[PDB]
Structures are given as C-alpha cells and as structure tokens.
Symmetry: D2
Subunit: 244 residues, 4 copies
C-alpha cells in the first residue's frame, strides 16, 4: 500500500486479462497508470472505474506513432513516466507445414517488434528522470519449447534476449529492464486450455493477481539491484524434468 | 509496513552481514524472527535491540541437533514457523593444486549440507501449518564459474539444484522453495574485494538491504506462484557476456 | 573420413566464412553438398573446385521460392536431403535510439525468418526418409546480452527457441534439430573486431574449422541421441562471470 | 577409426555400464585406456578381451591414493595421460524426511568429491603435456529437479558447476573441461526404470554407445574450441516443457 506512490506507468494490452490486473494492482499501490489496447470499448469502460488515477488510450503496439501518443499522454497528464509494462501479445499455433507465413509475421510484429517499439518510446522520458523500470512479459515458452508453437516460442525467447541487451545499455542511465515468465494463468487467452496442462509443483493454474504482485515488485524501487534477469512465476513447471 | 505480519521466520547466519539485514528487514515488516549463528556476542547484542520481536540462538548449521533446538525455539516462543532463510555460509579460495581437501570438505559441510539440514528441520512444522517459504541463498557463482573458487562454485551450484528437487517434493504440501543469487554485496565476507570486480550494468556493488527486499518478497504471500526458481539480484552481471 | 558418406546436405550462406568452411569439411567427410548464397561470383568459384561433390545455387534465405529451388536441386541432383545447416546471417549494430527500424526488420528477416523458411522447406524430404539433422547457427549472443546489439541478440535468442519447438515436433519423424553457439570466429563478418574482445579460457579466437568440426558431428549419426540442445563452442566465455 | 590414436585415457567406473562402453569405444578409435572401478572381477575380465590397449586398476574414486596409482599406471604403461572421463557414480533416492544423512554423505563423496579428486590427480601430467581433455559425467538431473532425488540432483548440479570453474582455471594450460548430461540410458543403474519415464522427442531411451560417441568427440581434438560447456544427450527431454 503506497509502494508505487509517485510512479507513473504505461501498460500495453491493459484492457483485459493480466494487463487489466496489472493496472488495478499498480493503482492500488499508489501509481498513476496510462494503459493502452485495441479493445476501446472495454478500455474506456474500466478507465471509468479507476477514474482520475488512470487514463485509457488506443494503442496498437505495432504503430510507433501511437506509442508516442501514449507516452505524451502519460507525461502531460501525470508529469512523467517511470514504468513500462510490455504486456500486449497474441497467441497462434500450427505445425511447421501448415503454419501460415502471415501468422508468423503477425506474431513477430506484435510479440517482438511491439516490445522493441515500446522500449524505444519510453527511454527519452526515463533517461531525463534518471530512473526507470521496464518490465517485459515473456513466458516459460521463452525458456523451453512446445510442439506447434513456433512463432510464440521464437518471440518469447527473443523478448528474453532483448531484455538483456537493453538492460546492459540502459543500466548506466539508471533504467532497469527485466523479464517475467509466467506459466498457465487464467485469462481469455487461455480459457480454452485445461488448467492442468502443465506439470506444476503447486498443482494449479495461477490467478492473474499472482503475476501482478511480481509486476508491482519489479516496478517498485525494492527491486533496485535486479536488472536483465528472468523472473519465473510458473508454479514449478520449469524447475522439474518432464516425466510420464 | 506489515507485509509479513503473522509470519515466524528462522534465519541462519543472522548475526552479521546480509543475515543481520534480513532479520531487521523482516521484523520491520511485522514478522517474528529467530536467528542463529556462531558469533554469540554479536548475536545477543542485536537480539537486545530487537528483544520483543526476535530471539537469538546458537546455531552451527552443520549440527542437526542445533537445528532442532532452533526450530523448537521458534515454535514454542512464537507459535509456529513459516519462513526459513538458509543464509549461513563461508568463502574460501584456492587453485586446483594448492586447495586443501579439508577446506573442500569444510565448505561442503557448511554451504551445502548445512542448507539440506535446515530444510529437513523445518518441513515438519511447515507441513502442519500448511503453508511455508524456504529461501536458499546461492550466488551468481552458482550460475557461472570463477578461477580458484572450486569449493564455493560447486556448493552454490548444488544449492541451486537442491532448491529445485525440494520445491517439486514440497509443492503439494503448500511449501515453496526458491533460491536467491546475488552479485557483489557490501558485507564483511567481501570487504577486501574491490567494489567493481564484476562488470555490472548499474555500475556499483549492492547494499545488503537491496537483497533483503527480495527476501521479504519471497517470504511474503505475494510470491505465492513462484517456486523452484532462481531470483537474480546482481546488477546485470550474468545478463551480459564477458568483454575486455 | 567417410563419416558423412551417403549424406546430402544443404548449407545456406555457404559462399564464404564459416559457411564455406562447413561445405569443405562435409565434402571431406564424404557428403554431397548443395550450398546457396547471394554472392554468386564467389559461390560459382568454389563450386568449380569442388566439382562433382557440390552444387551452388542462388539462395536468398528470405525468399521461400528460392528455398524450394534449393531443395529440389539437392533431391534431383543427389537423390535426397538429410542435413540442413542454417548458417546464413547478418550483423548490424546500434543503440536503442539511433537504430533504424529498417535495420531491425532486415535482421529479423534474414536471421530469424530465414531460418524458419529453411526448416519449412526441408521437412518434406526429411520426413519421407524418416531421418534428418537440422543445425541452426545461433551464437553466444543468443545466451547473454551485449550493448547496442538488440536486433542480433533478439534473433539469436529466437533461433535458440525455434530450435527447441521444432525438435519436439519433428522428433517422432526421426529428425533432430540442434543449435550451435560459437564465440568469436575469424571470418569477414568480424575481421574488424579485435580477436580478444571476449574473455576466454583458451585465450584466443576460433578458427572456422573448429566450428565446422561440431557441424560434422551434429550432421553425422554419431549424435543420434542429441536433439533440441545448445552446443557451445566459445572457448569458455559463457562459462565464466564477467570480471574487470 | 584412429580418431584418438596416440591418446591415453583414464576412465573411472569403467567396469560396467556406460563406463565400460566408453572404454570399448575409445579403444576402437585407437586410444590406450586405463580404467578403474571397485568391481575387480568384472574389471579384470574385460581387461582380458581388450588386450594391451587397456589396463584395469582397482580405483575407489573417494581415495586420493588410488587415483595417484591409477595415474602412475597410465603414465608408465602408456607414456602419458591426455583424457580423463569422470564417469564413476552412484544413485540413491529418498524423500526429504526419510533420507539418511549417511546416504547423503556417501553420494557427495562419490559423485562430487570423487570428481574433484580425479581432476586434481590428472592436472600435473596434462599440464606438462601442454594439453588435455577432462570429461565430467553429469546428467539432466543436473539441469532440473526430480522428487525424492535430492542427493543425486545436488551432486549433478555441483559437477556441472565444478566443470566451469576448473575449465576457466585450466584453459591457459591447454586443458579443456566439459560436462555431459545424458537422459535415460540402458544400464544396470536404471534397468528397473521404465524406458519411457521421461518425455522425449525421439520416443525412446538411449543405447550407451550413443553417449560414448559424445565422449569420443569431446576426447578428440575435433572439439578443440569447446570448454566449460554442457553437452546434452537426452533425446529432447529438457528442450520441452512438462505437460500432462
Ligand atoms: N494467458 C496465459 O496463460 C499466459 C500469458 N502470457 C503473456 O501475457 C500477456 C498478456 O496475456 P493475457 O492477458 O493472458 O492475454 P489476453 O488475450 O487476455 O490479453 C492480451 C491483450 O493484448 C491486447 N493486444 C493484442 N494485440 C495488440 C496490439 N497489436 N496492440 C495492443 N494491444 C494488443 C489484446 O486486445 C488483449 O487485451 C501476453 O504477452 C501473453 O503472451 C504469458 C504466459 C502465460
Ligand atoms: N558477501 C557477498 O558478496 C555475497 C554473499 N552471498 C551469500 O550470502 C550468505 C551470507 O553472506 P554474507 O552476509 O555476506 O557473509 P557473512 O560472512 O557476513 O555472514 C555469514 C554468517 O554465517 C555465519 N556462519 C558461518 N559459518 C557458520 C556455520 N557453520 N554455522 C552457522 N553460522 C555460520 C557467520 O558467523 C556469519 O555471521 C552466504 O551464503 C554467502 O555465500 C552470495 C553472493 C554474494
Ligand atoms: N563471425 C563470428 O564471430 C560469429 C558468427 N556467427 C554466425 O555464423 C553465421 C555465419 O557467420 P560468418 O561466416 O562469420 O559471416 P559471413 O559474413 O562471412 O557470412 C554470412 C554469409 O551469409 C550470406 N548471406 C547474407 N545474407 C544472406 C541472405 N539474405 N540470403 C543468403 N545468404 C545470405 C552472406 O553473403 C555470407 O556469405 C551467421 O549466422 C552468424 O551470425 C555466430 C557467432 C560468431
Ligand atoms: N544410467 C543412466 O540412465 C544415467 C547415468 N548417468 C551417470 O553416468 C555414470 C555411470 O552410469 P551407469 O553406467 O548407468 O551406472 P553403473 O551403475 O552401471 O556404473 C557406475 C560404475 O561406477 C562404479 N563405482 C561405484 N562407486 C564407485 C567408487 N566409489 N569408486 C569407483 N567406481 C565406483 C560402479 O562399480 C559401476 O561399475 C554415473 O555418473 C551416472 O550418474 C547420467 C545420466 C543417466
Ligand atoms: C495453451 C499453451 C499453454 C499456456 C501458454 O502461454 C501458451 C500455450 C499455447 C500452445 C499450446 C500450450 C498447451 C499444449 C498445446 C495444446 C499442444 O499440445 C498443441 C498447441 C499447445
Ligand atoms: C570476491 C569474489 C566476488 C563476490 C563473491 O560472492 C565471492 C568471491 C570469491 C572468489 C574471488 C571473486 C573476485 C575474483 C577472484 C579475486 C579471483 O581473481 C581469485 C579468487 C576470486
Ligand atoms: C563483434 C561482436 C563479437 C562477435 C559477434 O558474433 C557479434 C558482435 C557484434 C556487436 C559487437 C561485439 C563486440 C563488442 C561491441 C563492439 C560493443 O562494444 C558495441 C557493438 C558490439
Ligand atoms: C530413475 C530416475 C531417471 C534417470 C536417472 O539418471 C536417475 C533417476 C533417479 C530418481 C528417479 C528418476 C525417475 C522418477 C522417480 C522414480 C520418482 O518418481 C521417485 C525417485 C525418481
């Protein structure tokens, strides 16, 4: 409570799912949040309940002009920008043969290029403020592979790597960059998937707030000495070997 | 300010350095702490200025009988045990040729067996309580190697592995096990080492409280979905490649 | 000698550098090689001194039609296709701020999409034979980060991930997929870089044949039980922590 | 045939299982092998069928004096020592509670200290010769955890770490140190385990020769630029996420 007081955050894909949960969790901790998405109806809806501590903006992470608009909104409406949560992303599947090249390009644009564009857009205000925290949402699919999940796996691994190179470059400016790797979380992106698809040590899927707690920790100054690192919140899946 | 209220913790090697910092940080968050060490003078000293919320006990992590005594103290004095911070450890160096077999055995006993004994000692009360968090202190030397640091590297890698196997086994009982890997921290164990020995992105060594913040996070229920994972707090060292 | 006898291989970017070395090394071991590139003069030149054992074809890894032509050449000229070495790649640098979006897209197309296209192109003939070995050339930049190397790092991490997902999917068909991660190698891509830029245990840069030896091993049936794995040939760089 | 001609190797635990397979594979490639174990009957038996290419010696890897005797045998009988294969090891299981402290100590002595003693014993002759190759046999249990496998997991992770620190230290002397991580292999140590206990991409357990092929590669000069690295030969297990 009051752990993010004075912090301004930008969250991509915050109209629903984990993104929405992150917005709510950060506001509850005293932060001012600008969240963007492409689902304007839902976005404006919850922008109404968070009232004056949040602002919704239309943001297609593949459009650099929209990223700039999102950043300008944060800076002029709240005075600055200290946190970026690259959460927007999509999921598509398909075996090597019947996986469309267009789906491949689409997921690269959103899941990878979108994350890169967000980082380019927030460095200026963060460098001026001399402090900042960028949180990239990857997944355990960015740690190991899965059948018929080539585009998703490739981009989640890429986001993991992009996190490291940018962390090294921005470190001297006081900006931290870390990646979060969650396992199965109950959201509209995976409501069609059985909750026990992964072998976990805790024996259950995660509630979105459980990932949000990690977002708050990484956004706060409590995690001041962690940068370029992978934070896993998967209930123990990648900690064990695949058995039958 | 009250993130650990109602939690009872046992910290090994808490008389000084990071251990002491963890004790203070957890008490400040509302936890009751039992800390043990072999430096009784210093231990009793700070137990006095924490008298109401903490208890000091003599604890040589290589002696199972002392671990049991430490656990009994926590349970009878505070009603239970929910957190274990395996922090006690030593550091010795030497090349392959002139590294004494006795130093090798000594570091294995303290840094590895000591950690195992602590886990065996706390599982009973934690399993009864139905909830628990075990935090094993490894290091980045448990992620990559260093010249003339064979005993330390071997044990820190082992602690990292022990964290995973125990997390899988204890998960069903509601107990989480995670490892922390810090880089250079300002403590008596490394005050003879130049603060910039490691290439970091932040360009500085860490203050012990920076590692304590991560201990609090892992001890709290905020990290409910993280288990068997490595949490790195090294200022970016392992995120980059070794350059000249 | 004769370790690859009866094997037909396709090597992308084989007109010079490591690619050329791989072609020569595999021919010396009894394999028939079809190598493609965009440097036609050099390509036809060495195709001439390798006469009956190799065939050169123009191949821009970003063009699916050219990949098909390359595969058809291998199958009709040599009877089949058992090995694919995704070696083609480019290197560009730049900081988050002054790194052109066009350079970013270019490296994604060649280093990542190019690798994906190669895999899609060879699965048919390999699945019919019920055997095959795909070797993806990543780098240690696909294991850790580097300043001003965002596009390269992102794609090399992605290739590492793509290797795992495809290995799991193709495993049942008898096809193995592995990634190679070399450190500094003496080639035209890095002749402007000081040979001791990386901290290595061997104290030297690698000769391209040293990486080719690993390519032969992975192409042969000797490595029959290795798939979806990372093979590091960096002289010890990623095995140690970055010191000053 | 003749890939290890002129090389002298020392293999611990070579009387049966993978160790025996390594001895046979290396002899077939032209190497002279000294293998030790504690199963003298079986050891002398196969020392007979290999003739003068192989010498058997009694060797308890926990006894430094016996290691010295093994090394002296190699040097005086064959003129030198260029390869060490730390293969000897044991397997015991048990949950945290009912796992005997004696079993814990026993596995630490054999699986970890035994490996360290072997390295200390061979550095002298290798440093004089200008180069050498040390191959430490870990396992995928040294990469991820398993329930009721605490001693085994801890030591296999430690061997993985010991491989890196020693590789960095010995690199300047021309000595390479690498670790091998196999999955399920058909040997007496695991003949009671169902061949499909692990989820693999290849859908089968490995034949010991498949791991021996990797030992030969690492023992030969073909792998000249690989050191301090993990070589996985697990049929794809650790490349994928644990599913149900
Ligand atoms: N659901 C799960 O189990 C897991 C999800 N993740 C990651 O977490 C992130 C969010 O996941 P969920 O909330 O579960 O998914 P979700 O589908 O609920 O939400 C993703 C959001 O991104 C927005 N979005 C999509 N394309 C966009 C674009 N071009 N520009 C801006 N916004 C766009 C969508 O409208 C949606 O609100 C993604 O990066 C996902 O890959 C990671 C691990 C597990
Ligand atoms: N100092 C550093 O830069 C880093 C330290 N670490 C780890 O953090 C932990 C604590 O480190 P520091 O506070 O810096 O060290 P420290 O030397 O300040 O404290 C270690 C404490 O353990 C106690 N201790 C030693 N042997 C013991 C035994 N057999 N039984 C019980 N207590 C014993 C010591 O008396 C001391 O109070 C260790 O596990 C260490 O490996 C990890 C990364 C970096
Ligand atoms: N040079 C080094 O130190 C290291 C190189 N690598 C990787 O090894 C691979 C080969 O590297 P080098 O031989 O050193 O580089 P190089 O520059 O000598 O050769 C790359 C080759 O790819 C060809 N190529 C480029 N774009 C192409 C396209 N669109 N279609 C077809 N061919 C194309 C080039 O013409 C050239 O022959 C690359 O994937 C590189 O990232 C990895 C680690 C270290
Ligand atoms: N069997 C498997 O699936 C896997 C085995 N490994 C590792 O490979 C190595 C050999 O495995 P296996 O051949 O399958 O086991 P094994 O039981 O067939 O052979 C181990 C050998 O070591 C010898 N030995 C035992 N204690 C010794 C001591 N104190 N000093 C000297 N020799 C001693 C034994 O007599 C035996 O011949 C071990 O390090 C094991 O952990 C790794 C991954 C999988
Ligand atoms: C939902 C999950 C599991 C959680 C997540 O973040 C993404 C995916 C996407 C691909 C799915 C995987 C479960 C296993 C599937 C269902 C395979 O068997 C074919 C496609 C795979
Ligand atoms: C202090 C540090 C760095 C922080 C830490 O937790 C442990 C050690 C122990 C061995 C040291 C290493 C710095 C580099 C040293 C000084 C080598 O050059 C020889 C022994 C090595
Ligand atoms: C050549 C190497 C090292 C070998 C390789 O495969 C790629 C690169 C590309 C970026 C370079 C890096 C050396 C360090 C550099 C020079 C940084 O200081 C700015 C750009 C970086
Ligand atoms: C054989 C194998 C699998 C191959 C290996 O190198 C060691 C072990 C040892 C512990 C076993 C594991 C299969 C799963 C087991 C059977 C658990 O369910 C309890 C003990 C575990």
């Amino acid at each position: 409570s009051g752990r993010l007081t004075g912090k301004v955050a930008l969250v991509s894909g915050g109209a629903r799912g984990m993104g929405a949960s992150h917005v709510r969790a950060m506001v509850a901790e005293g932060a001012k949040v600008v969240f963007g998405d492409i689902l304007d109806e839902e976005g404006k809806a919850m922008a109404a309940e968070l009232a004056d501590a949040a602002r919704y903006v239309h943001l297609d992470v593949t459009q650099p002009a929209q990223w700039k608009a999102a950043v300008d909104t944060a800076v002029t409406a709240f005075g600055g920008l200290h946190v970026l949560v690259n959460n927007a992303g999509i999921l598509n599947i398909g075996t090597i043969e019947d996986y469309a090249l267009t789906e491949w390009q689409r997921i690269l644009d959103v899941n990878l290029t979108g994350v890169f564009l967000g980082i380019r857009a927030v460095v200026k205000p963060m460098k001026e403020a001399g402090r900042g925290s960028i949180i990239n949402i990857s997944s355990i699919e960015g740690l190991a592979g899965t059948v018929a999940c080539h585009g998703y796996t490739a981009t989640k691994f890429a986001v993991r790597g992009l996190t490291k190179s940018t962390a090294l470059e921005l470190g001297p400016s006081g900006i931290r960059v870390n990646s979060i790797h969650p396992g199965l979380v109950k959201t509209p992106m995976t409501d069609w998937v059985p909750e026990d698809i992964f072998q976990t040590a805790l024996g259950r899927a995660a509630e979105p707030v459980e990932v949000s707690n990690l977002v708050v920790y990484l956004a706060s100054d409590e995690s001041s000495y962690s940068t370029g690192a992978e934070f896993v919140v998967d209930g123990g899946t990648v900690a064990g070997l695949a058995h039958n």
